[PDB]
Amino acid sequence: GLCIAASEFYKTRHNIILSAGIFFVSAGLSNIIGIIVYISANAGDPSKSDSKKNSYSYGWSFYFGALSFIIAEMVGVLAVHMFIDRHKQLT
């Protein structure tokens, strides 16, 4: 993405931005899954009727991962749009 924002580069015109954009999205997607997967598991932990309030505290880190992952995704999206615009300009 850094090489694709003008340079000094790339020398992969646009194409690079599209690739970079997907990678950020995938990165975000992976992050969303990992956080969720980890999260899903703890909530189920039946223990067992008078908890969950109660029970534990949870995330925590999750929250951050919940925010960080989201942020990452957003960034990826932005990158993708940038590449798209670049592509448009070339055409």
Binding site: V77, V80, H81, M82, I84, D85, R86, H87, K88, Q89
Partner: peptide, 27 residues
Amino acid sequence: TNEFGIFNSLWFSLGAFMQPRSLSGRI
């Protein structure tokens, strides 16, 4: 090109806010 991505992101967000044959985005 940057605004063209904003107008589209708002269009896909409208295609998101729920309700041709480009097989890719079709499925």
